[PDB]
Enzyme design. Sequence first.
Site, PDB file in Angstrom:
ATOM      1  N   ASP A 351      28.361  84.943  53.954  1.00 41.80           N
ATOM      2  CA  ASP A 351      27.938  84.386  55.229  1.00 41.80           C
ATOM      3  C   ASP A 351      27.986  85.471  56.299  1.00 41.80           C
ATOM      4  O   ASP A 351      28.838  86.361  56.271  1.00 41.80           O
ATOM      5  CB  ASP A 351      28.843  83.205  55.593  1.00 41.80           C
ATOM      6  CG  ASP A 351      28.827  82.873  57.068  1.00 41.80           C
ATOM      7  OD1 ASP A 351      27.850  82.263  57.545  1.00 41.80           O
ATOM      8  OD2 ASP A 351      29.816  83.208  57.750  1.00 41.80           O
ATOM      9  N   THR A 353      27.513  85.027  60.147  1.00 39.10           N
ATOM     10  CA  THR A 353      28.213  84.687  61.376  1.00 39.10           C
ATOM     11  C   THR A 353      29.614  84.186  61.056  1.00 39.10           C
ATOM     12  O   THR A 353      29.781  83.205  60.322  1.00 39.10           O
ATOM     13  CB  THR A 353      27.435  83.635  62.159  1.00 39.10           C
ATOM     14  OG1 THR A 353      26.257  84.227  62.715  1.00 39.10           O
ATOM     15  CG2 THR A 353      28.285  83.076  63.276  1.00 39.10           C
ATOM     16  N   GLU A 442      28.257  77.828  70.934  1.00 42.11           N
ATOM     17  CA  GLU A 442      28.222  76.956  72.102  1.00 42.11           C
ATOM     18  C   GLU A 442      29.222  77.402  73.159  1.00 42.11           C
ATOM     19  O   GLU A 442      28.997  77.198  74.357  1.00 42.11           O
ATOM     20  CB  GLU A 442      28.493  75.512  71.685  1.00 42.11           C
ATOM     21  CG  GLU A 442      27.356  74.865  70.918  1.00 42.11           C
ATOM     22  CD  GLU A 442      27.633  73.415  70.584  1.00 42.11           C
ATOM     23  OE1 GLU A 442      28.820  73.031  70.536  1.00 42.11           O
ATOM     24  OE2 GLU A 442      26.665  72.656  70.373  1.00 42.11           O
ATOM     25  N   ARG A 559      22.119  87.674  68.913  1.00 45.05           N
ATOM     26  CA  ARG A 559      21.859  86.339  68.394  1.00 45.05           C
ATOM     27  C   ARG A 559      21.187  85.507  69.479  1.00 45.05           C
ATOM     28  O   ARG A 559      21.745  85.331  70.566  1.00 45.05           O
ATOM     29  CB  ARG A 559      23.162  85.683  67.943  1.00 45.05           C
ATOM     30  CG  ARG A 559      22.982  84.413  67.149  1.00 45.05           C
ATOM     31  CD  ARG A 559      24.135  84.217  66.187  1.00 45.05           C
ATOM     32  NE  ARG A 559      24.012  82.973  65.438  1.00 45.05           N
ATOM     33  CZ  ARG A 559      24.562  81.827  65.815  1.00 45.05           C
ATOM     34  NH1 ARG A 559      25.266  81.772  66.932  1.00 45.05           N
ATOM     35  NH2 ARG A 559      24.406  80.738  65.079  1.00 45.05           N
ATOM     36  N   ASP A 702      32.598  80.839  55.915  1.00 48.71           N
ATOM     37  CA  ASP A 702      33.579  80.284  56.835  1.00 48.71           C
ATOM     38  C   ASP A 702      33.178  78.950  57.445  1.00 48.71           C
ATOM     39  O   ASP A 702      34.018  78.308  58.084  1.00 48.71           O
ATOM     40  CB  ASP A 702      33.870  81.270  57.974  1.00 48.71           C
ATOM     41  CG  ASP A 702      32.685  81.464  58.902  1.00 48.71           C
ATOM     42  OD1 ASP A 702      31.531  81.180  58.504  1.00 48.71           O
ATOM     43  OD2 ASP A 702      32.916  81.865  60.058  1.00 48.71           O
ATOM     44  N   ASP A 706      28.300  76.802  54.370  1.00 44.15           N
ATOM     45  CA  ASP A 706      28.687  77.587  53.209  1.00 44.15           C
ATOM     46  C   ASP A 706      29.449  76.780  52.170  1.00 44.15           C
ATOM     47  O   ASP A 706      29.698  77.294  51.075  1.00 44.15           O
ATOM     48  CB  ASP A 706      29.547  78.785  53.638  1.00 44.15           C
ATOM     49  CG  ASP A 706      28.903  79.604  54.735  1.00 44.15           C
ATOM     50  OD1 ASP A 706      27.686  79.867  54.649  1.00 44.15           O
ATOM     51  OD2 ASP A 706      29.613  79.981  55.689  1.00 44.15           O
ATOM     52  N   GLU A 770      54.476  97.474  11.268  1.00 47.08           N
ATOM     53  CA  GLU A 770      55.565  96.781  10.594  1.00 47.08           C
ATOM     54  C   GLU A 770      55.084  95.944   9.420  1.00 47.08           C
ATOM     55  O   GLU A 770      55.901  95.553   8.581  1.00 47.08           O
ATOM     56  CB  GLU A 770      56.317  95.891  11.586  1.00 47.08           C
ATOM     57  CG  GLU A 770      56.610  96.549  12.922  1.00 47.08           C
ATOM     58  CD  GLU A 770      57.083  95.555  13.962  1.00 47.08           C
ATOM     59  OE1 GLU A 770      57.294  94.378  13.609  1.00 47.08           O
ATOM     60  OE2 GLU A 770      57.238  95.948  15.136  1.00 47.08           O
TER      61      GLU A 770
HETATM   62  N1  LIG Z   1      25.159  74.249  68.252  1.00 47.60           N
HETATM   63  C1  LIG Z   1      23.872  74.788  67.865  1.00 47.60           C
HETATM   64  N2  LIG Z   1      22.936  74.161  68.554  1.00 47.60           N
HETATM   65  C2  LIG Z   1      21.634  74.477  68.379  1.00 47.60           C
HETATM   66  N3  LIG Z   1      21.288  75.437  67.497  1.00 47.60           N
HETATM   67  C3  LIG Z   1      22.238  76.078  66.797  1.00 47.60           C
HETATM   68  C4  LIG Z   1      23.521  75.768  66.966  1.00 47.60           C
HETATM   69  N4  LIG Z   1      24.247  76.543  66.153  1.00 47.60           N
HETATM   70  C5  LIG Z   1      23.408  77.334  65.481  1.00 47.60           C
HETATM   71  N5  LIG Z   1      22.169  77.047  65.879  1.00 47.60           N
HETATM   72  C6  LIG Z   1      20.954  77.654  65.414  1.00 47.60           C
HETATM   73  O1  LIG Z   1      20.623  77.083  63.940  1.00 47.60           O
HETATM   74  C7  LIG Z   1      20.134  78.080  63.266  1.00 47.60           C
HETATM   75  C8  LIG Z   1      20.448  77.916  61.758  1.00 47.60           C
HETATM   76  O2  LIG Z   1      21.565  77.093  61.591  1.00 47.60           O
HETATM   77  P1  LIG Z   1      22.942  77.751  60.977  1.00 47.60           P
HETATM   78  O3  LIG Z   1      24.114  76.877  61.335  1.00 47.60           O
HETATM   79  O4  LIG Z   1      22.839  77.844  59.478  1.00 47.60           O
HETATM   80  O5  LIG Z   1      23.178  79.251  61.612  1.00 47.60           O
HETATM   81  P2  LIG Z   1      24.645  79.992  61.606  1.00 47.60           P
HETATM   82  O6  LIG Z   1      25.197  80.052  63.006  1.00 47.60           O
HETATM   83  O7  LIG Z   1      25.596  79.206  60.741  1.00 47.60           O
HETATM   84  C9  LIG Z   1      24.494  81.706  60.920  1.00 47.60           C
HETATM   85  P3  LIG Z   1      25.445  81.813  59.328  1.00 47.60           P
HETATM   86  O8  LIG Z   1      24.786  80.937  58.295  1.00 47.60           O
HETATM   87  O9  LIG Z   1      25.417  83.241  58.853  1.00 47.60           O
HETATM   88  O10 LIG Z   1      26.876  81.375  59.518  1.00 47.60           O
HETATM   89  C10 LIG Z   1      20.854  79.311  63.842  1.00 47.60           C
HETATM   90  O11 LIG Z   1      20.042  80.391  63.772  1.00 47.60           O
HETATM   91  C11 LIG Z   1      21.115  78.947  65.315  1.00 47.60           C
HETATM   92  O12 LIG Z   1      20.129  79.647  66.192  1.00 47.60           O
HETATM   93 CA   LIG Z   2      56.995  95.339  17.410  1.00 46.46          CA
HETATM   94 MG   LIG Z   3      29.399  81.623  58.956  1.00 42.35          MG
END
Ligand SMILES: Nc1ncnc2c1ncn2[C@@H]1O[C@H](COP(=O)(O)OP(=O)(O)CP(=O)(O)O)[C@@H](O)[C@H]1O
Ligand SMILES: [Ca+2]
Ligand SMILES: [Mg+2]
Length: 1010
Positions: A351, A353, A442, A559, A702, A706, A770
Amino acid sequence: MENAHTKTVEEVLGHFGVNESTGLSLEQVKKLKERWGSNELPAEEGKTLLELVIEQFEDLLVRILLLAACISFVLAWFEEGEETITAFVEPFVILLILVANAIVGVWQERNAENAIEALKEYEPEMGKVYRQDRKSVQRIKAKDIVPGDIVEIAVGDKVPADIRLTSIKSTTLRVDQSILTGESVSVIKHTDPVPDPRAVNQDKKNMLFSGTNIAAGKAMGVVVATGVNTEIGKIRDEMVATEQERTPLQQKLDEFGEQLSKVISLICIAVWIINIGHFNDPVHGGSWIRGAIYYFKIAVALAVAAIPEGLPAVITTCLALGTRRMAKKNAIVRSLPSVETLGCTSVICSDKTGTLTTNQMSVCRMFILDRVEGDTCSLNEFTITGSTYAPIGEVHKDDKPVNCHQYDGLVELATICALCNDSALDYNEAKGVYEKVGEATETALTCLVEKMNVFDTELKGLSKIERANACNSVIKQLMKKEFTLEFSRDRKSMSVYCTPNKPSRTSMSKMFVKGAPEGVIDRCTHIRVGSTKVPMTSGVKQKIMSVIREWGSGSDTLRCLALATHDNPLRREEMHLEDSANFIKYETNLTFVGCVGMLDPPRIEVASSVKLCRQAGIRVIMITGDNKGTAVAICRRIGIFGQDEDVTSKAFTGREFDELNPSAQRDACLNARCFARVEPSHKSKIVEFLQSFDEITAMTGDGVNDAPALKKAEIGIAMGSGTAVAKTASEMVLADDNFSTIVAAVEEGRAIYNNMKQFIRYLISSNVGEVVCIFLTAALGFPEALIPVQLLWVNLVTDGLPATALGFNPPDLDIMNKPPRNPKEPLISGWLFFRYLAIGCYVGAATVGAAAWWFIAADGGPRVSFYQLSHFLQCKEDNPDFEGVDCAIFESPYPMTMALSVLVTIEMCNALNSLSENQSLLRMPPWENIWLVGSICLSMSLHFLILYVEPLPLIFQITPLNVTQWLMVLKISLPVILMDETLKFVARNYLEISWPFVLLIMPLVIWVYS
Ligand SMILES: Nc1ncnc2c1ncn2[C@@H]1O[C@H](COP(=O)(O)OP(=O)(O)CP(=O)(O)O)[C@@H](O)[C@H]1O
Ligand SMILES: [Ca+2]
Ligand SMILES: [Mg+2]
Ligand SMILES: [Ca+2]
């Protein structure tokens, strides 16, 4: 409060006197923590002492020696049953080695489990609560939660105590409660009361139980039971014990021990059937059954000798050692044998992020639409100072201090960020830092709204606490949030329905959308320039995406998230919020407002760890849900790619990987190193495609996305700061978030396997010597050099501690410079079978040659010829061939002592060979394993004990040896080292120096060989 699921929310809140808005007062917490105590369970240990010892005698090889120890007791109870130091010595020395291996196995298992439980104390568990001191959510210790305080619950979190759900912020709330219930499915929870008072936990659909995870959604409730009053604390010891599938090496040594046990039985049967003629010998008394019983004791004694009874205990010691070594590097190994699977790992999926990056995000760039001249447009780009979650920093347009109130697009940009959050900013007085409550993405927007201050508020007199959510509260006081369409990775966005607290007569309700830039922009029909909106054309679309591409691929690897607004949304009654797939049908015809880009620095250890993995034949793959340009830019930073390498066929998206030929999709997983824009469903699909090519996959993640991939992998590693959903689905947790601990776990997994092969090499190559000793004496006709009590002494000193001390071997200097082994290859690998027979054939001939030396060449004994030795049974005074030869000397204990002393010494010199498979003693001297040196000096001390004290030689039927006979023992025992140095030489230079040691070994060689 006993049946909380039967009462409504107002009744369970009035029972404690709590408001959901403010929370629990500080005086109420002090009173409740006095009456209820800390929110924790008593620290119990896993296994008791007796049950830990019982699990040491559960293997076949150990149970065989128990049977033979009983046979040696029943078959000796008939002959002599008065003295306990001369009659039952055979059952004693078979048990004495079993206890020695049981003590070491228990001692190392106690050390591994005491180290793991000391690592659970690394960082304290936390829980978000609402208390009256702070008007926002604060993160407190999980053990500081008292029954009755409001607790905030978000996705990925772990429930800190028994919680009665009071309100659900999301549309749907799922909980994974296999820990308590056992169901493998996520369950939907609601707020309404369950009327059945005796309802099972399956039907308690309004209660959150401690220890369960949150699969989806966000909610909050009031705690009703803490500590041992939870449904998981009342059955904490009445819980079924886990039982996992046997890993390829665990079943390899199990099938090897059974195949070996069948060969040993045929060898011991062959001993009984070749000595048929010697049954009626006069030595036994002329009786057939008396001679058959004696040679049955020899078959049983050779069974105990040739069997590797210490193999189960050395596996326990090795796995317990590797588990204790990882805990020293802050790695909680949940499965004891799983630290071995990382040794044969071929691919490491990661992963991005939070795992490859520190997850310490910070909005450093943002832009809005300046104006439009034609089909294209011009933008207003900004920069924000600061990289911590502290709300200290200002915004610069073109390196000029600016106030965000002048820009109307920034006022709406902060409104979208503040309202479309499920996270907040928390100040920690203990550490003096600002921490996040929720997700790092966020929280980066929360800290941004505080820095912008679009509605200029006086922040000169606010506390450090209130300055964390000061400007955010001003936004929320203006607009009322009706409901939230929670973020789902299917649409990669999140929307929120808001209505202004201002009179609705002039201002209507809107939807504030935020999510992936390419996804949200595709659903935007208009664009917000200033305070007015114009229809979105194409020239605006590529111009905006161009800035997002330059930010991700830039020098900061930003990002990016797009922010939009839906000005004419459907009302709540005309919205079908039962399915999550319909949410993307509501986020259409949006109005593009702005786009923020935040920085996420990679970890420092990740760059060097990827290099050591490439050196050890391992391939690191990045499987992220983020953008492709951002993921590729990060890969070049940490070293997965090169700063100029072409990645046209090594980097794929979720769509591109789907739209591939079967041949192209086959070459993709074998050559691609980055996967971007993949859902949690695709991530596990990448992992199963890698395992389809017979590759041990190690997924590192994490977050929630995943968790399906952490379970599809052969071993999943979780970060300690990640969600509990991921930490539950993993086999190893990095408590300190160190990526160098992953490569240290791969080296430990290879080292554990190496110590097994050296244990297999030492026992097989020496116990077959042996066996050759028993059979070569029969093929030559010589007097047998060993009796059952001597075959059991050589089993004690040679198969005991000198064999178990091989699990403490230090690693090779090039252990991590070799490709990962094939887990389906054979264990012993053919060429080692030659090394076992080559050494065993010398060990056997050396023992037979030591007894024949005394009968022929020694001065203390007779000069019997080869013919008189081969036909010693045919010797009486009538025979003219045997004249002048006292044929009572053929029963002398001198050749039996010479053979027993050589067999012990040649096997101690063989243990010194079993420190590495190919490294000589000049490179890895014996003092690298100080446990092996002490075990050898102890075994020789025990051998010298039964030789030179008074009553012991009579028990073992031996005689003390002088220096002249002891010097002959070393003359035959030393060339077993020179013989293995030749086998290691051919292995290094044809199948693939410590001078302090040389100055010590040659004065001994000078004295031995004169
Ligand atoms: N709270 C949120 N609200 C709106 N969009 C979000 C968000 N968190 C992540 N995203 C967007 O959703 C997209 C894909 O979702 P995802 O959750 O798999 O990304 P991620 O932050 O987990 C990267 P990684 O998979 O490496 O951990 C991300 O590219 C992000 O721009
Ligand atoms: Ca032995
Ligand atoms: Mg991650
Ligand atoms: Ca043995």
